[PDB]
Paper text:
Histone deacetylases (HDACs) are evolutionally conserved enzymes that remove acetyl modifications from histones and play a central role in epigenetic gene silencing. [name] consists of three core proteins: Rpd3, Sin3, and Ume15 along with two dedicated chromatin binding subunits: Eaf3 and Rco1.6 The structures of the yeast [name] complex and its human homolog Sin3B complex have been recently reported.
Notably, the structure of the [name] complex discloses two copies of Rco1 and two copies of Eaf3. Both Rco1subunits are required for full functionality of [name].9 The two copies of Rco1–Eaf3 dimerize through the Rco1 C-terminal coiled-coil domain (CC) and the dimer interface packs against Sin3 paired amphipathic α-helix 3 (PAH3). Our structure clearly resolves an intact H3 tail (1–24 aa) binding to the [name], with the unexpected H3K18 residue poised for catalysis. The ϵ-amino group of the H3K4 side chain directly interacts with the carboxyl group of the D261 of Rco1 PHD finger, which recognizes unmodified H3K4.12 Methylation of the H3K4 residue shall destabilize the electrostatic interaction. Therefore, only the H3K4me0 tail could be grabbed by Rco1, which explains why [name] is restricted from binding to promoter nucleosomes marked with H3K4me2/3. The H3 tail (1–24 aa) enters the [name] active site and ties a small knot around H3T11. A cluster of hydrophobic residues from Eaf3 (Leu399), Sin3 (Val787), and Rpd3 (Val102) accommodate H3T11. The lysine side chain of H3K18 points toward the catalytic Zn2+ stabilized by H188, D186, and D274 of Rpd3.
Residue numbers in the entry:
A (entry chain A): 1 to 24
B (entry chain L): 2 to 386, 398 to 422
C (entry chain K): 660 to 729, 748 to 1040, 1058 to 1081, 1110 to 1320
D (entry chain M): 85 to 124, 258 to 480, 487 to 525, 534 to 577, 581 to 591
E (entry chain N): 218 to 400
F (entry chain P): 218 to 401
G (entry chain O): 260 to 367, 543 to 587
Write the structure that this text describes.
């Protein structure tokens, strides 16, 4: 089978994690 | 109960002559998080480079703590988490996808090469610092390599993978019935507060910036549950706190805690983030207003351990950690840097000072009185009353280290 | 009777709560208690937010319900986990660790943030340059130092081989970590230099066959060390000067946004909104706290005289330099400020003229020119050519002076009745005084600090300390700070000094404390412009026509002030809201009252 | 690298050191130093969740699934070998190429299980659809006006603050930050539409300070329901809370009450959700005093069991006073009984009450 | 066409709360509940059997109870689980294989999950091809069940705070369980 | 369901026996009666007032008490009277008309007619749309009301000094009067 | 019909045109002596109610809801007073339940609101006082043969 991927590895989405991948 | 008072020059107390023990593992400087990551373990090396040139090694005792084993790391963290840390490397990230989401590792806290080794340097560094205090060998332990207060039982948050402070405190708890933890990092010390929330044997007094600032916990009403009710103490400060206002809050609260809940030991986490100019923290503390926090806690006379914690601007945190190391050794350092390998950093006047900014101080005396009133209302309830244990092996590092740091270049 | 209050408690409560939408919630809360849903203590705590201020009422309510003064305090951050999830094992937890540590209660950012994320603290345009530089510093420093730690590790190894016999050399494999303390460091350095993947069979060759591998790897690692250092030195100059151009701006959070925030918040509108805001507070509470209605909503204080000669010489420079005002009229602008100041603040005019004269030196007859003469153009040329009834006192509060029966004979106290364009001209005068004075108060501490700062010997032998300002002369090494700040400002209006160089000089001299003196060129301009309105706008000039006569009057009866007030009111439109600026000669205290009477 | 292990090693490889390091090339000097020098086919959304993640893709049709969603869940570590199909495609393949008319296949299923016959078709059909994420049917969510589906399928209420535009958070000039009004904005202390000042409720003041002295200014925010301005000091409050959820001002009735029974340890009361306008029934009871509202009320100026009782204001005065007076009588009784009780436990009283006067 | 099912408001207000706990509060129900789909229908089938006299309706009742159980087993995997609960469902399957007993959802899941199936019954009915007289047969029969469920709503759906009781139908989710389920 | 109201057992005899007299003996009360509806009911508002301590309990007492004075007025001409009584009631309206003063049933008739209203009461709530909670209270004063009645049931329902015909509530009437009461 | 609904027996009738039911003159809510008769219609109370509201539910609910709000003085007797006007008069009939128990049968402003609030509070006070006082005189009577206070305060 072919599985694409996940682009980003966190459940928070980095909105609540500092030095965000997705929040600056 | 908040009395605004102008700042006073830091004065050394001749009554206390504590014999310090400094924990520096020479490797801890050689680990780097990422291409643009704020946490830079370089800051330990410069903060150590400055220390050796003031000749502070003449007063301190230089130690190299044996790195923490895989089992001893597990007395706080679950076996699944530690096992993930040992194998994980940048090449192995594809193999671990369920874990990397379950364990918040590798996205904001990156999986850099040497992830396990660096964490192993932090813990043996704080754990043994507690072990030496218990034996009575040293009245102070200084472990700037460690201090990572954001990690959790099975999660890596806030750049912190291994929560050494919990490992450090559990080592003190085997001899001292009560331990006090004091946080001066601008972020809330949720890693230690959530670990000791239930027990009364540890009080976690934390100063931080509330108002949807990471981790967005530590509200004033969080005072622990179960037995550890009122045995947690959060002081939610607002933006732009400065030298004179911070002292008018830090000193009255700490003086209350050490009266009502008499600690046998203190774990003071000297966060660098609170200083002015840091990239992630928003306070206006200068060095003299920040190092005064250490000098106050030291003056009480009970054994303490100083851990480095978080600092995100290498120039500022390396200067204040060297000054704080001066105060513990009963010497106020001169405001003139000595020649050191990392000399071009400390621009532009090349003096040992962190200059407070111009930003507007917003904490208001009417607000600070309401925060300090509620805390004092609560604190009147807290009246007093291959395994290695007591890891003690220390290694006597200075013979090897004297040629490092001390420079006669020209 | 005690019954009287209770039958009126809801009426007394209704009046204080005010709007109905808040009163309804007060009824709903009172309902929940009567439905046995809400406990008594919780009811009193909620009523506190309603009736907290009315202590005489709240105390009665606490008495009525029977409240007696002198776990469920969970907190918002932490949530309980189920019992099953706490079983995930820990290998090295002693029995003691189980009692102390916390396993049931947990709190996470994604819950405390309410899933909506966080706000990071904003940073400057320049403070983000010191962060780019910091990373460029670390990137060069990380690779070089991590390289050195391998050099010493291999150097001790290599000397061992040349001691050993060639046959011995055949079998001297190195355990991982090369015997060093760190197993990981020596891999991340070799892998970088030797082409990624190719690098892996180097390490295996380094372990399996070091005698022929270690000498070669050490050679290249030293060679890569020399290249890396030669770059840093070249990169050191780029980083040092860039940090010099943008450091003192990074600290200056308020200075950068000051120039735009000054013209936004120093206007005819906000200066009236600010003073009115204090008047409503004293009357609002009157509605609720019952504060009496007082005089002098706004209070100023003038401790130091020599600032006035300092502001005048500043506005003297701008007036002469300005191209907008026509040359014959500029003589009135100069002569307005000296006379108005010499009149309002009791300073003798001749003393002012010497102060301007000396400032002219630094770079033929005087008949009595009244301020009254200045305010009318027609009379000005002559001194240029030469060398209401049945009106009782009812307000009382408006005219502060009720000191003496009949006529007060000698009173320091003097009040100026003003339009909007008089008060604004006066708020533009205090605004400079507040900004200048706080500099002169620091002047004794700062002057000593600037002189005593010393170059570090290790930064003077090498060429490191910035010399840009010393060449330009904008470092307060040779003079007292405050007198130097003026003769820098005098150059700003003159246009000799660029704005960004004037500002940077006060950043290093005052550590960013004196940021307010970034618009001393514009505030001086706006003050002159408002002062120009006084000569023109013949309605406004007629107001200070009356003021000069009143200020010259030593003996003013209580009714005389009312006579003075009513005449001034005649000249304003019935819509405009006149101000009262009050002066106390003995204590140099100026108190402004906001008036919107009949 | 390669090497006669006895002989010398052939040099591994000439280091292709073009690193494009944050500085331009680690070995390269700074370039031109102009500034800084003073002098010179398958879908990307899971068919079940409708969101992103690691997917396991159907081979026949362009439908992707999460690893958790597909029934039964499939481990990311261990997967079925070879090609994979969604349960829908497996059905079509199943049906096709064998006993192809569905009818006959289905006609056997209904005849197979005659007891469940009423559910026969529904059981047979469920074998054909792909796994799905449960979403409440619209006729339920439409009953309550307040509730609305969020961007992710979340439950979003009237309490959740409408999200800030991503531009407003990250695109502001330095001097003014919208997210935090921690830079002396004086236009906070003004009511935009009316032009009067906002007055705090606790201290009945507005503290707009001079531009000369901004430390006299105290921050003010307004409720999200009440619109009654409060200082950030009066309600002790650290910050403005403009991200997470609407800030409920103090002074607004409780929507959830935990009552300790004082003898389960506690009882819970939750206000009835607001029903759609037509399905709501407002009732004014014939009994003025003592009607059990259960906490749901509309204040009159002067199967639907979800009925909001309408209560006159004068009724609440009688109810609240009625509750108070009854408790006072009970409290006086117990205290008087206990003092009389010690007399009950009591030849000669010797209470000395005659001496007392 | 379009089939209408009259769910009493109280049961229609429970579900919405269930939609709030699982998507916003991020808490899931303790899976091995006390009142499972099996005994809920066991009681209802037993309480109503004695109530009705005509043997013709007893056949109609018993199959609707027997049928709803069999349908629930097939349905729970496909469309009766929110995304956050998928992992908890998976661990039950993963526990079942080790315990060597096949999972039977009616034995595990609670009454609220039965109500989820009832909510989407009209949508499931409309998709298929059924006799009209059977459509009113199910809907009328279900409307009779929901009425019975209303009379007993108190002791199936109780509002207890998970932090407090620990007997509450819902239990919170660890930061690690939530991470895998959502991530 | 149907509203359950409990008459005291002696009061049940009072009404049932009283109905026997009017149909058979054809006796009619002397009107205005010895014990008016008012002072019987107004007095209830007085004693029970000094017994209830709550504010609301004092309101509900005057509420139900004042309403009964109002309800009896409209409900007299409609239901409470008998065939024979109705003929006697008709005169009153002419008698009130001859004075032009309005006829006020409450002040004139006796308490036994009030007892008749309470007996018919639980049927009357059945026609109304009041919810249960409101109906409970209407009943709760009613039952507590009749609990008072037993204390003074001897005074005015029961014949005190029964020898005199005036003490007897109902007094015998002429047969030709009864013929008009038939209406045929 | 032949019988009178309110005489429960056959009587000479005045007849409402709309409703077939007719009543005997004696049982007239307002006495209506045969000699003097209304003009033609003689609408019964039940019929008079329908034409008054014009057989409209919305007004009926409204005129009801107005009637309850109007009689805030006596609210508990609101629906009962509202209904009694519509129903036609009926002879008093001893209800079955009282009969069934017996074995045998023979024949087959703003200030006003404050004042209304004040007096109830005031009346409540003495009741509270006198009950508290009577417990106190039970305390003195608990001391046998004489009061402990020996007097009244
Ligand atoms: Ca604690
Ligand atoms: Zn921090």
């Amino acid at each position: 089978a072919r599985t694409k991927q996940t682009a980003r590895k966190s459940t928070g989405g980095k909105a609540p994690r500092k030095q965000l991948a997705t929040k600056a | 109960v908040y009395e605004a008072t102008p700042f006073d020059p830091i004065t050394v107390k001749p009554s206390d002559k504590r014999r310090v023990a400094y924990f520096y593992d020479a490797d801890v400087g050689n680990y780097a998080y990422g291409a643009g990551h704020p946490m830079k373990p370089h800051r330990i090396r410069m903060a150590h480079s400055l220390i050796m040139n003031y000749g502070l090694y003449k007063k301190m005792e230089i130690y190299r703590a044996k790195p923490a084993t895989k089992q001893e790391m597990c007395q706080f963290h679950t076996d699944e988490y530690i096992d993930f840390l040992s194998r994980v490397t940048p090449d192995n990230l594809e193999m671990f996808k369920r874990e990397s989401v379950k364990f918040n590792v590798g996205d904001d806290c990156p999986v850099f090469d040497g992830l396990y080794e660096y964490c192993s340097i932090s813990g043996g560094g704080s754990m043994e610092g507690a072990a030496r205090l218990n034996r009575g060998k040293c009245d102070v332990a200084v472990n700037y390599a460690g201090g990572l207060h954001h990690a959790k039982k099975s999660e890596a948050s806030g750049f912190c993978y291994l929560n050494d402070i919990v490992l450090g405190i559990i080592e003190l708890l085997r001899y001292h019935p009560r331990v006090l933890y004091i946080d001066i990092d601008v972020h809330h010390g949720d890693g230690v507060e959530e670990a000791f929330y239930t027990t009364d044997r540890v009080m976690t007094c934390s100063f931080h910036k509330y108002g949807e600032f990471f981790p967005g916990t530590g509200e004033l009403r969080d005072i622990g549950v179960g037995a550890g009710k009122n045995y947690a103490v959060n002081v939610p400060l607002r933006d732009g706190i400065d030298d004179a206002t911070y002292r008018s809050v830090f000193e009255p609260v700490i003086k209350k805690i050490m009266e009502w809940y008499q600690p046998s030991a203190v774990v003071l986490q000297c966060g660098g983030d609170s200083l002015s100019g840091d990239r992630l923290g928003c306070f206006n503390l200068s060095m003299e207003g920040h190092a005064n926090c250490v000098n106050y806690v030291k003056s009480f006379g009970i054994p303490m351990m100083v851990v480095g914690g978080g600092g995100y601007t290498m120039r500022n945190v390396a200067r204040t950690w060297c000054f704080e190391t001066g105060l513990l050794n009963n010497v106020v350092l001169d405001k003139d840097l000595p020649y050191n390998e990392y000399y071009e950093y400390y621009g532009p006047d090349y003096k040992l000072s962190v200059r407070p900014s111009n930003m507007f101080n917003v904490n208001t005396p009417e607000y600070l009185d309401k925060v300090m009133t509620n805390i004092f209302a609560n604190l009147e309830n807290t009246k007093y009353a291959a395994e290695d244990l007591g890891d003690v092996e220390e290694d006597s590092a200075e013979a090897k280290d004297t040629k490092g740091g001390s420079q006669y270049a020209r | 009777i005690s019954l009287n209050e209770e039958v009126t408690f809801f009426e007394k409560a209704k009046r204080y709560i005010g709007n109905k939408h808040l009163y309804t919630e007060f009824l709903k809360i009172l309902n929940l208690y009567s439905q046995d849903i809400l406990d008594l203590d919780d009811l009193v705590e909620k009523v506190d937010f309603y009736l907290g201020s009315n202590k005489e009422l709240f105390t009665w309510f606490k008495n009525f319900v029977g409240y007696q003064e002198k776990c469920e305090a969970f907190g918002p951050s932490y949530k309980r986990l189920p019992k099953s999830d706490t079983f995930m094992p820990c290998s090295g937890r002693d029995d003691m660790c189980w009692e102390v540590l916390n396993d049931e209660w947990v709190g996470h950012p994604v819950w405390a943030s309410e899933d909506s994320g966080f706000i990071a603290h904003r940073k400057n345009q320049y403070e983000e340059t010191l962060f780019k530089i910091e990373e460029e510093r670390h990137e060069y420093d990380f690779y070089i130092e991590s390289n050195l730690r391998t050099i010493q590790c291999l150097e001790t190894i290599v000397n061992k081989i040349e001691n050993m016999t060639e046959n011995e050399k055949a079998n001297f494999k190195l355990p991982p970590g090369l015997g060093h303390t760190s197993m990981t460091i020596y891999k991340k350095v070799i892998r970088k230099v030797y082409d990624k993947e190719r690098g892996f069979e180097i390490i295996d060759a380094l372990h399996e066959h070091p005698a022929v591998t270690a000498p070669v790897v050490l050679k290249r690692l030293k060679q890569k060390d020399e290249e890396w250092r030669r770059a840093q030195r070249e990169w050191n100059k780029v980083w040092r000067e860039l940090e010099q151009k943008v450091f003192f701006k990074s600290l200056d959070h308020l200075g950068l946004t000051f120039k735009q925030a000054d013209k936004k918040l120093l206007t005819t509108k906000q200066l009236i909104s600010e003073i009115s805001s204090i008047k409503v507070d004293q009357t609002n509470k009157k509605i609720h706290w019952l504060t009496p209605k007082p005089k002098s909503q706004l209070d100023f204080d003038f401790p130091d005289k020599n600032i006035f000669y300092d502001i005048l010489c500043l506005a003297d420079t701008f007036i002469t330099h300005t191209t907008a005002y026509s040359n014959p009229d500029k003589e009135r602008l100069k002569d307005l400020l000296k006379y108005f100041i010499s009149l309002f603040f009791s300073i003798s005019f001749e003393k002012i003229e010497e102060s301007l004269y000396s400032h002219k030196q630094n770079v033929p007859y005087q008949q009595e020119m009244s301020l009254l003469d200045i305010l009318h153009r027609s009379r000005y040329q002559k001194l240029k050519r030469s060398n209401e009834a049945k009106n009782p006192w009812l307000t009382g509060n408006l005219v502060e002076e009720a000191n003496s029966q009949g006529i007060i004979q000698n009173r320091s106290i003097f009040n100026l009745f003003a339009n909007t364009n008089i008060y604004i001209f006066f708020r533009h005068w205090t605004t400079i005084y507040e900004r200048l004075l706080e500099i002169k108060q620091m002047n004794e501490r700062v002057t000593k600090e600037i002189n005593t700062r010393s170059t570090v010997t290790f930064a003077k032998d090498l060429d490191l300390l910035s010399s840009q300002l010393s060449e330009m002369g904008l470092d307060f090494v040779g003079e007292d700070a405050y007198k130097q700040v003026l003769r820098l400002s005098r150059r700003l209006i003159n246009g000799d000094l660029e704005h960004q160089w004037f500002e940077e000089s006060l950043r290093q001299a005052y550590n960013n404390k004196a940021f307010k003196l970034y618009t001393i060129d514009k505030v001086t301009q706006s003050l002159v412009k408002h002062a120009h309105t006084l000569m023109t706008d013949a309605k406004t000039a007629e107001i200070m026509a009356l003021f000069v006569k009143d200020r010259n009057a030593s003996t003013t009866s209580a009714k005389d002030q009312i006579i003075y007030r009513l005449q001034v009111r005649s000249h304003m439109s019935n819509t405009e809201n006149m101000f009262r600026i009050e002066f106390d000669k003995r204590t140099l205290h100026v108190s402004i009252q906001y008036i919107a009477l009949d | 690298l390669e090497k006669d292990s006895k002989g010398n090693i052939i040099k591994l490889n000439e280091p292709s050191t073009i690193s494009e390091d944050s500085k331009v090339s680690v070995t390269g000097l700074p370039l031109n130093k102009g500034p800084s020098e003073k002098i010179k086919e398958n879908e990307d959304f899971c068919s079940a969740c409708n969101q992103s993640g690691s997917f396991l893709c159907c081979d026949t049709c362009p439908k992707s699934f999460h690893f958790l969603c597909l029934d039964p869940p499939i481990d990311p570590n261990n997967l079925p070998k070879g090609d994979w199909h969604c349960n829908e495609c497996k059905f079509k393949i199943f049906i096709n190429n064998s006993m192809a008319t569905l009818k006959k296949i289905e006609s056997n299923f209904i005849k197979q299980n005659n007891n469940v016959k009423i559910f026969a078709k529904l059981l047979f059909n469920i074998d054909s659809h792909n796994p799905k994420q449960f979403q409440l049917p619209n006729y339920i969510k439409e009953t309550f006006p307040a509730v609305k589906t969020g961007s992710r399928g979340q439950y979003s209420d009237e309490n959740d603050k409408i999200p800030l535009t991503d531009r407003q958070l990250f695109n502001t000039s330095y001097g003014q930050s919208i997210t935090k009004l921690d830079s002396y904005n004086p236009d906070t202390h003004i009511d935009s539409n009316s032009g009067k000042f906002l007055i705090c409720y606790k201290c009945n003041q507005t503290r707009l300070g001079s531009w000369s002295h901004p430390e006299n200014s105290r921050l003010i925010m307004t409720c999200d329901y009440c619109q009654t301005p409060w200082h950030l000091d009066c309600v002790p409050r650290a910050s403005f809370k403009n991200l997470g959820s609407k800030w409920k001002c103090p002074l607004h009735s409780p929507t959830k009450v935990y009552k300790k029974i004082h003898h389960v340890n506690y009882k819970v009361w939750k206000k009835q959700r607001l029903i759609n306008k037509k399905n709501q029934l407002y009732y004014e009871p014939l009994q003025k005093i003592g009607y059990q509202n259960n906490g749901n009320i509309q204040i009159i100026p002067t199967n639907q069991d979800f009925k909001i009782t309408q209560i006159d204001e004068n009724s609440i005065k009688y109810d609240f006073f009625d509750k108070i007076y009854k408790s006072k009588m009970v409290q006086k009784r117990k205290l008087f009984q206990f003092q009389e009780s010690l007399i009950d436990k009591l030849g000669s009283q010797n209470g000395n009450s005659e001496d007392n006067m | 066409p379009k089939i209408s099912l009259q769910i009493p408001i109280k049961l229609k207000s429970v579900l919405v709360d269930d939609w709030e706990y699982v998507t916003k509060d991020k808490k899931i129900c303790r899976l091995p509940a006390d009142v499972t789909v099996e005994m809920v229908l066991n009681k209802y089938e037993h309480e109503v059997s004695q109530e009705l006299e005509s043997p013709g309706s007893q056949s109609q009742l018993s199959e609707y109870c027997a049928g709803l159980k069999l349908y629930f087993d097939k349905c729970l995997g496909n469309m009766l689980l929110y995304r956050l609960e998928r992992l908890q469902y998976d661990e039950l399957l993963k526990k079942s294989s080790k315990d060597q007993k096949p999972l039977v959802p009616i034995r595990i899941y609670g009454a609220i999950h039965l109500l989820r199936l009832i909510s989407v019954l009209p949508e499931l009915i409309s998709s298929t091809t059924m006799d009209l007289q059977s459509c009113q047969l199910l809907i009328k029969q279900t409307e009779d069940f929901l009425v019975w469920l209303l009379m007993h709503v108190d002791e199936y759906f109780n509002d207890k705070d998970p932090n407090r009781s620990d007997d509450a139908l819902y239990v919170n989710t660890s930061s690690q369980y939530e991470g895998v389920a959502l991530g």
